Ligand binder design. Sequence first.
Ligand SMILES: CC(C)(C(=O)N1CCN(Cc2ccc(Cl)cc2)CC1)S(=O)(=O)c1ccc(C(F)(F)F)cn1
Ligand SMILES: CC(C)(C(=O)N1CCN(Cc2ccc(Cl)cc2)CC1)S(=O)(=O)c1ccc(C(F)(F)F)cn1
Ligand code: NA
Ligand code: NA
Ligand code: NA
Ligand code: NA
Lengths: 203, 203, 203, 203, 203, 203, 203, 203, 203
Amino acid sequence: MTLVPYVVEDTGRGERAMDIYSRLLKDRIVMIGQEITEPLANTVIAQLLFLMSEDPTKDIQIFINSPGGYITAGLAIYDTIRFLGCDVNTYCIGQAASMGALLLSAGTKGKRYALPHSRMMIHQPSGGIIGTSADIQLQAAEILTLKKHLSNILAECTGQSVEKIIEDSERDFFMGAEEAIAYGLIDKVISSAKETKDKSIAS
Amino acid sequence: MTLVPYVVEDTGRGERAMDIYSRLLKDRIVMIGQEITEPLANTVIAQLLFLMSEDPTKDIQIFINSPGGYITAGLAIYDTIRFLGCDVNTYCIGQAASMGALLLSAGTKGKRYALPHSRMMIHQPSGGIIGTSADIQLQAAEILTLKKHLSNILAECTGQSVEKIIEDSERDFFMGAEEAIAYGLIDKVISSAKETKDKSIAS
Amino acid sequence: MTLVPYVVEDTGRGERAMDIYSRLLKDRIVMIGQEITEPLANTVIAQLLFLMSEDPTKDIQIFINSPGGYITAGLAIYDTIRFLGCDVNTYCIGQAASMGALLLSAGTKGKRYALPHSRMMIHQPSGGIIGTSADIQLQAAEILTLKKHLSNILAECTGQSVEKIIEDSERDFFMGAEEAIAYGLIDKVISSAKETKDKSIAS
Amino acid sequence: MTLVPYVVEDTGRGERAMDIYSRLLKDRIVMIGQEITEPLANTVIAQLLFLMSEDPTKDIQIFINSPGGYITAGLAIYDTIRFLGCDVNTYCIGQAASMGALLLSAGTKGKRYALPHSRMMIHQPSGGIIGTSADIQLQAAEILTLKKHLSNILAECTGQSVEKIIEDSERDFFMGAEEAIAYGLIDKVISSAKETKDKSIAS
Amino acid sequence: MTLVPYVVEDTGRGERAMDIYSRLLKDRIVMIGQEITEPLANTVIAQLLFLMSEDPTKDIQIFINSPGGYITAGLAIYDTIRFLGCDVNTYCIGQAASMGALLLSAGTKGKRYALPHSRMMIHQPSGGIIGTSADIQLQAAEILTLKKHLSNILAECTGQSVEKIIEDSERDFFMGAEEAIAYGLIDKVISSAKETKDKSIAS
Amino acid sequence: MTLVPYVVEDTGRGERAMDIYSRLLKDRIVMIGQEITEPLANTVIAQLLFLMSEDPTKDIQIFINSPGGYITAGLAIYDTIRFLGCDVNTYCIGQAASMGALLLSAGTKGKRYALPHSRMMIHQPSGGIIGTSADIQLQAAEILTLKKHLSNILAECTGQSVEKIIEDSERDFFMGAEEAIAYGLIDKVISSAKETKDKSIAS
Amino acid sequence: MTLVPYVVEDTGRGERAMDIYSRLLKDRIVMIGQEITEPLANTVIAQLLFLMSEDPTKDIQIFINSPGGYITAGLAIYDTIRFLGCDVNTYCIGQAASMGALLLSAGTKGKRYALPHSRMMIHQPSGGIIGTSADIQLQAAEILTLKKHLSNILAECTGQSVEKIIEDSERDFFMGAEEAIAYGLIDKVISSAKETKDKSIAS
Amino acid sequence: MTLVPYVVEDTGRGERAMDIYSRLLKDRIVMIGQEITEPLANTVIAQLLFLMSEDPTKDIQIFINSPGGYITAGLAIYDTIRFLGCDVNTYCIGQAASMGALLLSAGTKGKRYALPHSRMMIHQPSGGIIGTSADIQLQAAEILTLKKHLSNILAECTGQSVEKIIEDSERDFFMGAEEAIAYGLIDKVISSAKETKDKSIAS
Amino acid sequence: MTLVPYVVEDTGRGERAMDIYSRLLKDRIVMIGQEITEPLANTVIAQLLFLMSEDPTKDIQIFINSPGGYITAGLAIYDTIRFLGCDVNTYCIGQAASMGALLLSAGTKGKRYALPHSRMMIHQPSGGIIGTSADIQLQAAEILTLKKHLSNILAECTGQSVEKIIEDSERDFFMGAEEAIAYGLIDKVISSAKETKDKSIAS
Ligand SMILES: CC(C)(C(=O)N1CCN(Cc2ccc(Cl)cc2)CC1)S(=O)(=O)c1ccc(C(F)(F)F)cn1
Ligand SMILES: CC(C)(C(=O)N1CCN(Cc2ccc(Cl)cc2)CC1)S(=O)(=O)c1ccc(C(F)(F)F)cn1
Ligand code: NA
Ligand code: NA
Ligand code: NA
Ligand code: NA
């Protein structure tokens, strides 16, 4: 019973019947509240490519509540985030585990936020190289390359060494918002709207 | 099997087709009428983020009829509620158990209401502590952290000690509207619109 | 279920209500983000034939994230791509295996790109004689013609010999963006707007 | 995962929901990309009858990628195509087996095309037909009559004898675009719009 | 909790628990009470070959209540019945349609019986000449061969001409025990054990 | 779910395990406790044919609790009951509707019994016709013969005219044990062992 | 639908409960009455290896009614048949298509039989070489080796050339018992027994 | 689909129903004819541990027809095979891929056989993890250890270098019986009884 | 579908059929080859309680190939193992993770073995709520208590500190047989039956 409410308005002379997620997309807000799967990667990348078509310079806000995902889908989104020319804001509401922590740390330095009770983890809890039979088929020398990619990206994003990233990816523990700042995953804890999201009319 | 009714008003030039829940969202009314799950949390946070992107100062009304949920989803919604800059009114119609009681007590102090026959409980039945179906990855120190977060938030919201909150979270009992006022969960019992802040409609 | 967000443009008060993928199609962007099946081939060819009807000379961008597919569907899309009179840009986001690599290499020479962490393979992964239509069909001597067709097309697109393509098609390994340039599958690696070489001029 | 794309205008302000297949239908393009079943025949005949209501003289383009089908549905579409008063262009993208080859050869002589790597077969793929939820169920003397009809029609369309059509219909082999021209199934192999490089032939 | 009741007697040389159908097999009684399918034909032929393995000279009784079946399965059983060296008694209880009518008429002349209210039909009610492995159906010259085989066997068994058998196979009507004797399908109506060539199998 | 208790035996030199229904079959007791379907008729006829193979002269007891069934299956059992040479005792426990009433009245005259609260009906109840709910087979002019067969048999068994049987088959009402005696369906109401024969000689 | 009768038989020493197929296995009779799949090959090979352990010199009779199968399973059974040291008799009841025809022709030359109305085909129907959705499935050069193996075995077994076997494997036609003798598939058509346990009666 | 014929034989006078696979187990024959999964490994290891309890010195025959499997299950069986003190004979009937080839090459040197048309491959055609609980993740250093174990064991069993084993495990090709002898996977191709160990040793 | 083989024995007294697992149970061998769930624990404890009733002094061998399980089931089995009075031998074939490692280390000191390529982990790979009623019961302070119990038992069994057990339970890594000896999980690596104790002909 997943009710998907809509939005449309009369503060002027208008219309615009769209659902709630398309509305937030009008403010350049992208929601990641899934497991990071291949069908999600396509929808998020599609949203990211569209937002670059509209204004390739305005900031984009990404809100992340993800229990994990797959390396193949996460790497696709990360490369798309790096492919963008504008600044990307990443907010962690709730949990950002494994791939969620990768995309969270992939935001523009200084614009990666978390909420006071957010929890973040680098360990991949689910999906041993392949998880559910929806996303399958990874040989040997291929998971190492994807894991080597993930370790190198996390080390670059956080500022830790690749060795430390590998060691901490083996530990099944979450870290709080304050710990994640020290680790390099995020930049600031917030408790009210950081007005980095402010736009009303384009320019 | 329960029909999502639609709505059409008389703004003259604008005529606008939305369902009943999107209509209530136009009055800054958010409905929580089911278990607090991860997909529901995403919808509720999306609604909350949209309502702040439209009027970040106008009051928001949240109506809660929830048999419970998961701590991770509730903490995400609570942090989003605290993330808002405007006042939040919480109304308990029917039942607000565990996570429903958390969001109910999370409203702005003085603006937390319940109906005469409402029932409220802080005890979390079963193992509703993370995520959704499956999503049951634990370690030890993570349940301790999530329960410590919930106990600390409930103690702050209600005004009771953390020890009392933990002790009462172990008891499977409901409390009425009058008891919930004494406990600190809510502020006032109501039975009509004017029992809240009254704007003095003429007669 | 994956929420496919919708879109609303400017300068007119009306009611589009088109999704994100149809929106990108307005910019002549075609998304291939799943297995290359017969129903998918119909979608891509329909998109390709429509884009030729609107402007048969403007460039078309194809974004590819495909774990593989079937030769029967791949050959249909390739012939349609060669059937186009305009330039085709192919971008590999994530993975392009077997049929994904065929369509990726089918783009206009100089306009085949990949992202820094993309993975490409010509081997048909994890199984497959190719061909399922509620019935396998494609007897022995028919798969040979299709495999010979695929080998000849890959050799023509990449620049390698047919013998090398056949030898490399039996090896279950992926190659990175730099290796794929040397191989002939793609032309350029892409990681920023100023490092494009694509220079997306439109709208 | 599904067939997504939609279409809107350019020659005004942009408001009406058209999917990709109805869009191509506005250019009098009919897509046959699956097994020739009874529900498909109804849709195709409905499209054909509609296209005749708008212009009984405008040319109609039919694109065929079909692994086969049933005699009852194929004969119905063929009779409807012969029922049209305008010229019918048939394009074979990918595979046209049995019923696909019948409808492909049913186009106006001189306007039956195939793509360079297309494969065509007159044999009923896999097995014959008696009907399992797709051709109902057929007595003895009736499948012979329907098979005789198909043999007689193919001989007239291709120019071969009825004996050779029956004689070749038992052989499970595909033929290429060049072989199909010699056989009489099609007229020209192409690599650009309609008659290669132009909506009309030059000499 | 097992259906198909069990039985015990034959205390002479001593034996154990068998089901009811195995009991009748001890009296050389074979039951055909459902559609003549390929798995049923295998069971019946296995039973037919076993009774010939024990003593190839004692009479065999076949009781038939079959609404029809497939020609491939019926021809297999008929050839196995003709392959036997002993006399075969066929009894029609209830209905013997199409394939049931062939096996009924395949008994030794003079030992084909029916009960007073039995109904017999030569028509196959629209569908089924082959069991099929959920993959395959039949070419033209293959239905013709199977129909010729069925017509020739029925003409030989009943004594009618092949033309009349073909004509009557197109008519969807049942015939009674008296009509079936005149037709040649059976030999005698019995309506009791002690009547006619068999005076019951008792002991 | 339909627990079928088992039993173990003295009365021969063998020793063995059967369920409760197979045991009652050793006392020549046949249970009919469900709808008269084609698979049930085969089981009942198999039991009847086996009981004749052991003693074609000893009495057989049939206990009937049937809400109805189909004429094709009922006629098969009735003809098999008439095929027996020994006396058949029919007992109605609970309900005997349509086909159940046919088999009940088919017992040897004087040996058809019912229990004090049993209910009997000649009307064919809610549902399907003569055969199977989905696999349905008789065609035109076949209902006349099958209904005439049922009317003629009921008239002979009960002693009423065919006209009265046809008229009473049209009314949806049950009759008690005393009414069924007057009607001719049964002979005696019973309530103790001595109401049976139990003529002489120990057992 | 369990339709496997059991035996406790008359004509044996002792007391045992085996099903009908195990009974025929005691006479060294192996039944192949369904599609040649991988699980079937394992059971058949198990039966073949058991029969060699019991008496590695006594003849084995195999009865074949198979609509086809897969090359991998067919090759496994054929190699096991060649692995046996005793003579193998193959009987074709009904149909022996593709793999069934391979195993039929694999019997000892001079001891391959068919019934008068049997139908045999060497064409591999439908398509594929293993797989219902993803069963095994093979790369290119591996299915070719299996097809070359099958062609070479059929040519050796029948006596035809490899070229003719390849040509006839592409033609969807059946041949009768007399035609199959001329082709080399079988040796004799039969209509009466020739097996051992002859010239004697039981009891 | 579990057709598993039974047997009752000379473990005495002959009185016990066992299936065909347990039958070969009485001759110390173990069948591996399906995917090597965790439940299969438990059954096979249980069979292996039982066979060592009965006679820890008598030879064991293992027949292998396996399309592949999982590393964890294969390693478990191999360690159990190496744990045995007696000689193990491995026969490859049909296909032995990846894990099947591991167990095949794990037989006692000199006692590893294949049939003339058997196909063997060391490449894992599917890959991925084993789903041991379908809930997990598999880190880096664990796939490396499992792949290193497989490479080291295959190199020791075959005699090739670990580097060659790694290179050939990436190539999707099968090898014939003669090629597998040269490779070291097996020792002899067979077509009759061939080798054994019961006599004075050759020298 | 693994075909759990059956067994036949006692060539002196005769007649019993047990499966392979019940067979090994007669040798006081208990197999744990799956996830340690509540239904599995009941079977294992039942086996353990039976084995103590027959001989409460003879050694018991437990073979473990378990990817994990639930604490409630693991604690139940462990307490039952400690409840036994006889020596318990634990063998790790393949993998012993979390609960499997608990039961493995619960064997009598000096009699805990592993195979050369076995892998052992104390970390619970993904879950840990533990329990029943759709996988979710068991409140917070109760999972913490059960985890404390598990840490205390592992520390006592292995010899490490409780702090080290807690620290290592959070690390997702496997250790080999040699590492497990140093850690305290096991005592000896083995590679053949006769590496420990002595078994020969009885007296
Ligand atoms: C059948 C045996 C005895 C055999 O192979 N022979 C080979 C060669 N013989 C003559 C020979 C000798 C040397 C040379 Cl140079 C050439 C020819 C004689 C016997 S067997 O291999 O012992 C065997 C196979 C299978 C089974 C089982 F599967 F049933 F268990 C049991 N035993
Ligand atoms: C000790 C072993 C090696 C053995 O050989 N035995 C033989 C006979 N026995 C007879 C018996 C019967 C009944 C009873 Cl009451 C008592 C004794 C008992 C044991 S073992 O424990 O079987 C064993 C250990 C490890 C492995 C592994 F490593 F492969 F996994 C496999 N087997
Ligand atoms: Na609680
Ligand atoms: Na590279
Ligand atoms: Na009464
Ligand atoms: Na013939």
